[PDB]
Design an enzyme around this catalytic site. Structure first.
Site, PDB file in Angstrom:
ATOM      1  N   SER A 195      31.563  50.252  50.999  1.00 26.14           N
ATOM      2  CA  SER A 195      30.560  50.077  49.928  1.00 26.14           C
ATOM      3  C   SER A 195      29.538  49.334  50.439  1.00 26.14           C
ATOM      4  O   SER A 195      28.621  49.680  51.290  1.00 26.14           O
ATOM      5  CB  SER A 195      31.213  49.491  48.806  1.00 26.14           C
ATOM      6  OG  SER A 195      31.429  48.279  48.678  1.00 26.14           O
ATOM      7  N   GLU A 322      35.324  57.550  43.041  1.00 28.89           N
ATOM      8  CA  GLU A 322      34.660  56.191  43.228  1.00 28.89           C
ATOM      9  C   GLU A 322      34.297  55.566  41.894  1.00 28.89           C
ATOM     10  O   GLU A 322      34.121  54.300  41.796  1.00 28.89           O
ATOM     11  CB  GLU A 322      33.255  56.581  44.101  1.00 28.89           C
ATOM     12  CG  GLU A 322      33.507  57.242  45.332  1.00 28.89           C
ATOM     13  CD  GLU A 322      33.854  56.035  46.315  1.00 28.89           C
ATOM     14  OE1 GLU A 322      34.108  54.859  45.944  1.00 28.89           O
ATOM     15  OE2 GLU A 322      34.015  56.421  47.430  1.00 28.89           O
ATOM     16  N   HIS A 435      37.759  53.671  43.896  1.00 30.68           N
ATOM     17  CA  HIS A 435      36.805  52.911  45.043  1.00 30.68           C
ATOM     18  C   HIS A 435      37.509  51.980  45.573  1.00 30.68           C
ATOM     19  O   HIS A 435      37.667  50.852  44.874  1.00 30.68           O
ATOM     20  CB  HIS A 435      35.458  52.562  44.011  1.00 30.68           C
ATOM     21  CG  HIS A 435      34.528  51.696  45.006  1.00 30.68           C
ATOM     22  ND1 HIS A 435      34.686  50.483  44.763  1.00 30.68           N
ATOM     23  CD2 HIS A 435      33.577  52.435  45.727  1.00 30.68           C
ATOM     24  CE1 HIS A 435      33.657  49.823  45.912  1.00 30.68           C
ATOM     25  NE2 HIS A 435      32.994  50.882  46.311  1.00 30.68           N
TER      26      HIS A 435
HETATM   27  C1  LIG Z   1      34.673  44.613  47.772  1.00 32.47           C
HETATM   28  C2  LIG Z   1      35.285  45.957  47.184  1.00 32.47           C
HETATM   29  N1  LIG Z   1      35.660  47.217  47.508  1.00 32.47           N
HETATM   30  C3  LIG Z   1      35.918  47.918  46.231  1.00 32.47           C
HETATM   31  C4  LIG Z   1      35.947  47.085  45.144  1.00 32.47           C
HETATM   32  N2  LIG Z   1      35.457  46.028  45.714  1.00 32.47           N
HETATM   33  C5  LIG Z   1      35.263  44.770  44.561  1.00 32.47           C
HETATM   34  C6  LIG Z   1      34.749  45.171  43.268  1.00 32.47           C
HETATM   35  C7  LIG Z   1      34.035  44.662  42.240  1.00 32.47           C
HETATM   36  N3  LIG Z   1      33.688  45.512  41.343  1.00 32.47           N
HETATM   37  C8  LIG Z   1      33.119  45.125  39.827  1.00 32.47           C
HETATM   38  C9  LIG Z   1      32.818  43.735  39.490  1.00 32.47           C
HETATM   39  C10 LIG Z   1      31.508  42.832  40.260  1.00 32.47           C
HETATM   40  N4  LIG Z   1      31.744  42.972  41.847  1.00 32.47           N
HETATM   41  C11 LIG Z   1      31.001  43.894  42.709  1.00 32.47           C
HETATM   42  O1  LIG Z   1      31.287  43.710  43.738  1.00 32.47           O
HETATM   43  C12 LIG Z   1      29.589  44.845  42.235  1.00 32.47           C
HETATM   44  N5  LIG Z   1      29.602  45.976  43.304  1.00 32.47           N
HETATM   45  O2  LIG Z   1      28.525  46.930  42.848  1.00 32.47           O
HETATM   46  C13 LIG Z   1      31.437  41.461  40.059  1.00 32.47           C
HETATM   47  C14 LIG Z   1      30.376  40.399  40.267  1.00 32.47           C
HETATM   48  C15 LIG Z   1      30.401  39.017  39.925  1.00 32.47           C
HETATM   49  C16 LIG Z   1      31.689  38.315  39.870  1.00 32.47           C
HETATM   50  C17 LIG Z   1      32.886  39.119  39.685  1.00 32.47           C
HETATM   51  C18 LIG Z   1      32.711  40.672  39.885  1.00 32.47           C
HETATM   52  N6  LIG Z   1      34.083  46.634  41.635  1.00 32.47           N
HETATM   53  N7  LIG Z   1      34.584  46.584  42.775  1.00 32.47           N
END
Ligand SMILES: Cc1nccn1Cc1cn(CC[C@H](NC(=O)/C=N/O)c2ccccc2)nn1
Ligand SMILES: *[C@@H]1O[C@H](CO[C@@H]2O[C@@H](C)[C@@H](O)[C@@H](O)[C@@H]2O)[C@@H](O)[C@H](O)[C@H]1NC(C)=O
Ligand SMILES: *[C@@H]1O[C@H](CO[C@@H]2O[C@@H](C)[C@@H](O)[C@@H](O)[C@@H]2O)[C@@H](O)[C@H](O)[C@H]1NC(C)=O
Ligand SMILES: *[C@@H]1O[C@H](CO)[C@@H](O)[C@H](O)[C@H]1NC(C)=O
Ligand SMILES: *[C@@H]1O[C@H](CO)[C@@H](O)[C@H](O)[C@H]1NC(C)=O
Ligand SMILES: *[C@@H]1O[C@H](CO)[C@@H](O)[C@H](O)[C@H]1NC(C)=O
Length: 526
Positions: A195, A322, A435
């Site tokens: 990502s 995703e 995802h």
């Molecule tokens: C590295 C990885 N590979 C697959 C999944 N992940 C992590 C992930 C996190 N989130 C939504 C929440 C969001 N974080 C993001 O990383 C946004 N991305 O656009 C967030 C922002 C600030 C504080 C806490 C959380 N969805 N997947």
């Protein structure tokens, strides 16, 4: 057991994997720590040292907000950092096979996390399996994320932007100078990431300063042409003073604003990061890549369209579901603890959350293309559509479009469609092939038979690891030994891709064609 690098001497540790040994060098610094006066600017050349550096433990992770929406839940906390946070975090790791190889292909990993989160220390980024099974050398680095790494006043060296990208780049340079002493081939270096990490990989393809630092590239669920990938300069600077008024650092001499932003403790900078955009999003890159004119010299979609990137082989791919991961971070009617059956109006409310500054007619256009069901009366119709809407818009279509545009300039491209749902995936079943949950298969975690994975997952991981390594060493992600499906080149005309799963690996054409045309031809107009 002790390696002499071109700026100092580091000691590592031996690990027993699969009845063999892997030498791990955990936490090697590649830059002067960006503290004090150095906060917010490009990383500076780490000067020489005298001691034997004891690189036997992951170093500090960079400062970052934590996902607290599911405390105690492994599906969420899996991704939260597992070492101390600190502004002093520009370190890297090296896994070399034992006994030390001679001219080994090097794999450099760049983690994701919306450019706001992430760390190399994560369990599912352990490169010891890859070093053992395929005797490649695995490297991963920590780069600054959020505002500490991507705050931008364009032009201003005190805060030019893309610092975390330049962090990454200085690590690539460290491999160029020092990976020989580890038995690695600086002329055979494959970047891969996921990502936000994958977007960074594609940006290193555009950035001239990185062209001489790697040979090939793998992109997992991400590319720079994704709507969350690059921040404008319009909204960038709007986002910095919004952070300055929130910190009481509003001045008018932009350099003296920065000096004010440096005597604020990292926690105050983290806290205000969220409120910087008025209407957030589950995928809100509050501080991300910008066209700084140094790392990124033009608008990347123009560089892409006009073929202004490193010519080499790419491996690109996405997962089947995703989008689902983000629906439980705000979308109404969704939860990880029920089947999340939503209605038409919960769907429409969900669009406003994912498309807040988008016209009423724009939201209606999305609804019209995804709610003309293959058939009505099914209760999951609206639940499944909004997952696909977020998936197609944010990941699947930009990766495909990136691959077509890259392939049109005559380079070998390979596209995959990961559609296996982990048997250990903590999140519920309606969320499907989520995802991020191919990473454990890439790093070879199902190979440890003690780790609760099924035999079929061990087989699938085993073949993926082979395919990934062959692409790294030989530019072609085949599995020649066992009687397995050959992976064809992705041509802009035929658009062949390979599906990855336990049952069968089939070769299909023109993934999500109708859905992606909507997102790439007629939605960018609204
Ligand atoms: C590295 C990885 N590979 C697959 C999944 N992940 C992590 C992930 C996190 N989130 C939504 C929440 C969001 N974080 C993001 O990383 C946004 N991305 O656009 C967030 C922002 C600030 C504080 C806490 C959380 N969805 N997947
Ligand atoms: C660095 O480490 C040196 C050796 O570490 C010890 O010996 C090795 C063989 C392992 O068994 C390890 O677990 C031991 O702790 C120390 O002698 C030296 O003091 C260390 N230096 C610093 C600055 O910590
Ligand atoms: C730029 O920022 C303006 C100010 O936003 C408001 O104040 C900041 C400190 C936050 O609390 C934010 O949530 C508030 O909405 C916005 O009014 C404006 O729309 C933004 N964009 C532009 C192009 O000016
Ligand atoms: C490693 O391979 C490259 C490929 O061109 C070659 O130039 C280099 O000399 C080799 N080095 C060693 C130590 O084998
Ligand atoms: C802003 O302040 C810095 C430091 O005092 C100075 O070098 C610079 O010339 C100032 N710029 C303007 C436009 O006043
Ligand atoms: C190929 O199949 C054999 C069993 O016939 C298995 O032991 C081996 O791990 C497989 N290799 C790959 C790369 O899938």
């Amino acid at each position: 057991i002790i390696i002499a690098t071109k700026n100092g001497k580091v000691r590592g540790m031996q690990l027993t994997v699969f009845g063999g040994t892997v030498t791990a060098f955990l936490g090697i610094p590649y830059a002067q720590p960006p503290l004090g006066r150095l906060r917010f600017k490009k990383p500076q050349s780490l000067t020489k040292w005298s001691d034997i550096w004891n690189a036997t433990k992951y170093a500090n992770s960079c400062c970052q907000n934590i996902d607290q929406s599911f405390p105690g839940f492994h599906g969420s906390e899996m991704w939260n950092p597992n070492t101390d946070l600190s502004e002093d975090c520009l370190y890297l790791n090296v896994w070399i096979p034992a006994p030390k190889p001679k001219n080994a292909t090097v794999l450099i990993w760049i983690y994701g996390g919306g450019f706001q989160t992430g760390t190399s220390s994560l369990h599912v980024y352990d490169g010891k399996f890859l070093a053992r099974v395929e005797r490649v050398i695995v490297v991963s680095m920590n780069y600054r994320v959020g505002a500490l790494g991507f705050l931008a006043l364009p032009g201003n060296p005190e805060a030019p932007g893309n610092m975390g990208l330049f962090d990454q780049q200085l690590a690539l340079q460290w491999v160029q100078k020092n990976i020989a002493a580890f038995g690695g081939n600086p002329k055979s270096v494959t970047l891969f990431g996921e990502s936000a990490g994958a977007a960074s990989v594609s940006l290193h393809l555009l950035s001239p300063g990185s062209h001489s630092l790697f040979t090939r590239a793998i992109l997992q669920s991400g590319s720079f042409n994704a709507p969350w990938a690059v921040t404008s300069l319009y909204e960038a600077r709007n986002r910095t003073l919004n952070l300055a008024k929130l910190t009481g650092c509003s001045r008018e001499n932009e350099t003296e604003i920065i000096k004010c932003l440096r005597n604020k403790d990292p926690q105050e900078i983290l806290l205000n990061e969220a409120f910087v955009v008025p209407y957030g999003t589950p995928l809100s890159v509050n501080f991300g890549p910008t066209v700084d004119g140094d790392f990124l010299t033009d608008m990347p979609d123009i560089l892409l369209e006009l073929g202004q990137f490193k010519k080499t082989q790419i491996l690109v791919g996405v997962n089947k579901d995703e989008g689902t991961a983000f629906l439980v971070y705000g979308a109404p009617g969704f939860s990880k603890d029920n089947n999340s059956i939503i209605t038409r109006k919960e769907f429409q409310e969900g669009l406003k959350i994912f498309f807040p500054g988008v016209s009423e007619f724009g939201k209606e256009s999305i609804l019209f293309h995804y709610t003309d069901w293959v058939d009505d009366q099914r209760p999951e119709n609206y639940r499944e559509a909004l997952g696909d809407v977020v998936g197609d818009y944010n990941f699947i279509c930009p990766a495909l479009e990136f691959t077509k545009k890259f392939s049109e300039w005559g380079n070998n491209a390979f596209f995959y469609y990961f559609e296996h749902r982990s048997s250990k995936l903590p999140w519920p079943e309606w969320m499907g092939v989520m995802h991020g949950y191919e990473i454990e298969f890439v790093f070879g975690l199902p190979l440890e038979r003690r780790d609760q994975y099924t035999k079929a997952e061990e087989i699938l991981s085993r073949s993926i690891v082979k395919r990934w390594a062959n692409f790294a060493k030989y530019g072609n992600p085949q599995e020649t030994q066992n009687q397995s499906t050959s992976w064809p080149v992705f041509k802009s005309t035929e658009q062949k891709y390979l599906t990855l799963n336990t049952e069968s690996t089939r070769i299909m054409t023109k993934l999500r064609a109708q859905q992606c045309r909507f997102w790439t031809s007629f939605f960018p107009k609204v």
